[PDB]
Design a protein around this ligand. Structure first.
Ligand SMILES: NC1=NC(=O)C2=N[C@H]3C(S)=C(SO)[C@@H](COP(=O)(O)OP(=O)(O)OC[C@H]4O[C@@H](n5cnc6c(=O)[nH]c(N)nc65)[C@H](O)[C@@H]4O)O[C@H]3NC2=N1
Ligand SMILES: NC1=NC(=O)C2=N[C@H]3C(S)=C(S)[C@@H](COP(=O)(O)OP(=O)(O)OC[C@H]4O[C@@H](n5cnc6c(=O)[nH]c(N)nc65)[C@H](O)[C@@H]4O)O[C@H]3NC2=N1
Ligand SMILES: [Mo+6]
Ligand SMILES: [O]
Length: 779
């Protein structure tokens, strides 16, 4: 049996595995990783945990009745174990039947999800590769992270902005005087990467603290970011950040401090925004005192913050939670507008940055080449013949349930009108929509419209428990692959080597789709005559020929594989200043906006005439907010990203023991809010509102501000009874309480953090958790 060490990587970093008699027994972090993540131990455990999917399973009702099956029982665990040949035939038959009967509009292939890194074993692209050969599919656009901000930014600054390289960390160390983390917890969220992370922000944060720079955190929760710096902490009522920004802007106008030259030469439309700010249009001057009444943040604090930002070199590093809410578009639009008034855009250490908390943004980029990977083939096809009627071929990701509920209906998106297709089948790989999507009870009922639902995963998630057909996938650690280290830095290329043999009857997504493509008569088209190592060698060889051309030397494929990693050099990467060239000469280097300047007022958005997205940053009442006029529930749920999970990943591993409270997902509550309900620390509680009800376990702390509770997203939904409408979730999936609505007509983003609820001590009948053990028939 195999004994030795093997280096690989993941979403949590680079590591070395210890293998003993063919079993991975420890994962040790890479020696050059400046800040390893404590979740590595959970990654290892994820391979062997009790929720690992062993065999291909078919839903008993679906097996016996096909499309006439009762669809209300999806999720009850009544599965039938089948052979791979049986399951593959069924999957291929169903894909073919739906394509022939309904056309490409009948198959939803968006399959949103964080999957695993790797250029070959990219399950979502592999699924689209197969669906392409099958006749077509409906896809998803945008994402659940910057759903509103990625659509508003291009109308304001010209590009996406959120997924672009930031002013380098070192530039910040020598020039920044005031660092503001606005709705950002970089310490918590910098642990993972889309591709292998280099954890480059930790060293960057460490240099700011060593320099003694003043740090301000604006967040309702006292996070590790606050604690790490001993920062001045401002706690607004969730969803009122725009009110505070207007209050600050108003102060800068009233005391005549803002930068008129900056505004005059680099922006457009300020004069159309001024009247609103002064109350000329609505009779409501947006003062610091007016902001105080809405946000709860003292008027004088708001004025002192405004003045400090204007007199010191300030960097506004904003997170994404505050645009994952109703009217999300205004949050970063107003932030840029405030940034414009301060006049530091394009100066070393000043301006704003939207990716300092995500995937190493700000870590100096190397001069290394770009790495490519398997494609879905669409760019060299001549896909479906599509047209309105049948409907749109692309929907904004968060409108999947609206689509199911309203086939043929029209919807708005960024100035256009399209129709919802009539989807009959959904195929999901590498995602967990039964945890990640909003308003669980609404979505549980809307799923009944799908005849067939196919899922691949290696863990028994809520999504997999609800499938008609479940196929067991392998982890990254049971195969070979290649991937980039550093989403922005491009630190190097890593060989992701196989650690152990596939467990049970698990198969890679690639092999599964290969076999399904074979049954549709398209085997060679899918595989291209290459095997695993042939694909990986061609990605590397292409990068090397690109490297060569640019003067970067790279070893031959087998030399690279023997080493396991290539590292690229940093040349001018550490001196990068975002927007510097625009500041230096705006006429020669203008933005990609109609006017070529920062658009505070948008004529383009004006012509769309959307009620929920005015032509300039505006304060608007959200669906529900803490202490809002007529608010029905009293507590705001900060349903943010989990510290010891990657979304739902690693919930069914040994890490859960360290944070669960009586077996349930933890809930942070302030002592005063606990006292009022006669709630003691460690008690099981019922959290509920009009959309659903869930059980969590309380942790009493003053880390959360009064009026706010913290229940992280990602908990595995564990319904008491799937056939009972609004059944109680026994574990703690925060998305059973959120609403499923668009941010506005412009972006249609998710409003996953626009949630209010009530909490009461749980006194009902004892409950048995069943989400962390495999379905009985799957053992
Ligand atoms: N109320 C909410 N608040 C929020 O803040 C919140 N966040 C969003 C955002 S920001 C995201 S990402 O943009 C989504 C993430 O949902 P996702 O389904 O990507 O989550 P995961 O728990 O990472 O599911 C991944 C899934 O894939 C499996 N897997 C891994 N490797 C592969 C593979 O190679 N083969 C297969 N077939 N499967 C793979 C994992 O095991 C895992 O189950 O959440 C939003 N919701 C929010 N709500
Ligand atoms: N460890 C960890 N696990 C993860 O699951 C995770 N996921 C990754 C992904 S996919 C992304 S897209 C990003 C998300 O990065 P993002 O900035 O969207 O993260 P959140 O955890 O949702 O919110 C961050 C902070 O915003 C605060 N906040 C909430 N609402 C308000 C409010 O209205 N006003 C203010 N001022 N602040 C508020 C929260 O309290 C929290 O500390 O993180 C990434 N990093 C990840 N880290
Ligand atoms: Mo995200
Ligand atoms: O994401």
């Amino acid at each position: 049996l195999a004994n030795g060490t093997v280096m690989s990587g993941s979403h949590w970093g680079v590591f070395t595995a210890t293998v003993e008699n063919g079993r991975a027994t420890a994962f040790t972090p890479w020696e050059k990783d400046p800040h390893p993540s404590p979740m590595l131990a959970g990654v290892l455990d994820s391979i062997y945990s009790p929720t690992r999917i062993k065999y291909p399973m078919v839903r008993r009702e679906f097996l016996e009745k096909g499309v006439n099956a009762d669809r209300s029982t999806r999720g009850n665990g009544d599965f039938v174990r089948v052979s791979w040949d049986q399951a593959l035939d069924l999957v291929a038959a169903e894909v073919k039947r739906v394509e022939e009967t309904y056309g490409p509009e009948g198959v939803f292939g968006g399959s949103y999800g964080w999957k695993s890194p790797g250029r070959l074993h990219n399950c979502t692209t592999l699924l689209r590769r197969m669906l392409t050969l099958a006749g077509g599919y409906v896809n998803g656009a945008g994402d659940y992270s910057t759903g509103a901000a990625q659509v508003i930014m291009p109308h304001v600054v010209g590009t996406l902005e959120v997924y672009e390289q930031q002013t380098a960390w070192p530039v910040l160390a020598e020039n920044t005087e005031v660092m503001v983390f606005w709705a950002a917890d970089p310490i918590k969220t910098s642990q993972i990467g889309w591709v292998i992370p280099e954890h480059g922000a930790y060293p960057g944060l460490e240099a700011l603290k060593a320099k003694g720079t003043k740090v301000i955190v604006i967040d309702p929760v006292r996070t590790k970011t606050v604690e790490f710096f001993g920062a001045e902490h401002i706690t607004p009522k969730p969803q009122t950040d725009v009110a505070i920004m207007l209050g600050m802007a108003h102060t800068l106008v009233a005391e005549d401090l803002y930068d008129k030259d900056f505004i005059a030469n680099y922006t457009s439309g300020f004069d159309k925004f001024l009247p609103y700010l002064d109350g000329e249009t609505d009779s409501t001057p947006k003062t610091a005192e007016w902001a105080e009444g809405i946000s709860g943040v003292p008027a004088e604090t708001i004025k002192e913050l405004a003045r400090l930002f204007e007199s010191k070199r300030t960097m506004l590093a904003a997170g994404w939670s505050m645009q994952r809410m109703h009217h999300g578009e205004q949050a970063h639009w107003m932030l840029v507008t405030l940034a414009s008034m301060l006049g530091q855009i394009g100066l070393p250490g000043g301006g704003f940055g939207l990716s300092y908390h995500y995937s190493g943004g700000g870590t100096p980029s190397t001069s290394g080449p770009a790495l490519a990977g398997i494609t879905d083939g669409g760019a060299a096809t001549k896909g479906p013949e599509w047209l309105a009627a049948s409907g749109a071929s692309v929907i904004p990701v968060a409108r999947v349930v609206d689509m199911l509920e309203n086939p043929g209906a029209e919807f708005d998106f960024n100035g256009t009108r399209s129709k919802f297709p009539d989807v009959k089948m959904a195929y999901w790989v590498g995602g967990n929509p039964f945890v990640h999507h909003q308003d669980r009870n609404r979505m549980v009922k809307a799923w009944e419209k799908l005849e067939t639902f196919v899922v691949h995963d290696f863990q028994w998630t809520p999504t997999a428990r609800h499938a008609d057909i479940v196929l067991p996938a392998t982890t990254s650690y049971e195969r070979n692959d290649i991937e980039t280290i550093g989403d922005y830095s491009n630190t190097g290329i890593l060989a992701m080597k196989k650690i152990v043999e596939p467990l049970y009857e698990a198969r890679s997504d690639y092999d599964i789709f290969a076999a399904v493509a074979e049954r549709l008569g398209k085997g060679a088209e899918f595989t291209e005559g290459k095997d695993e190592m042939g694909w990986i060698k061609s990605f590397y060889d292409d990068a090397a020929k690109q490297g060569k051309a640019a003067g970067v030397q790279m070893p031959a494929f087998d030399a690279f594989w023997a080493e396991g990693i290539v590292e690229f050099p940093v040349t001018d990467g550490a001196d990068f200043v975002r927007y510097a060239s625009f500041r230096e000469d705006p006429l020669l280097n203008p933005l990609g906006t109609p006017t070529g300047l920062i658009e505070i007022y948008s004529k383009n958005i004006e012509k769309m005439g959307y009620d929920d997205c005015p032509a300039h940053p505006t304060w608007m009442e959200p669906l529900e907010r803490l202490d809002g006029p007529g608010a029905k529930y009293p507590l705001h749920i900060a349903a943010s990203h989990p510290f010891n999970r990657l979304h739902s990943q690693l919930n069914g591993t040994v890490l859960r023991e360290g944070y669960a409270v009586q077996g349930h997902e933890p809930c942070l509550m302030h002592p005063d809010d606990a006292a009022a309900r006669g709630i003691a620390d460690g008690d099981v509680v019922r959290v509920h509102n009009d959309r659903g009800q869930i059980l969590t376990g309380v942790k009493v702390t003053d880390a959360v501000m009064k009026g706010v509770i913290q229940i992280y997203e990602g908990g595995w939904y564990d319904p008491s009874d799937v056939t009972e409408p609004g059944t109680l979730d026994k574990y703690g999936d925060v998305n059973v309480l959120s609403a499923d609505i668009g941010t506005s007509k412009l972006a249609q983003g998710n409003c996953g953090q626009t949630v209010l609820a009530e909490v009461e001590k749980y006194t009902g009948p004892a409950v048995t958790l069943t989400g962390f053990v495999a379905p009985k028939a799957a053992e």
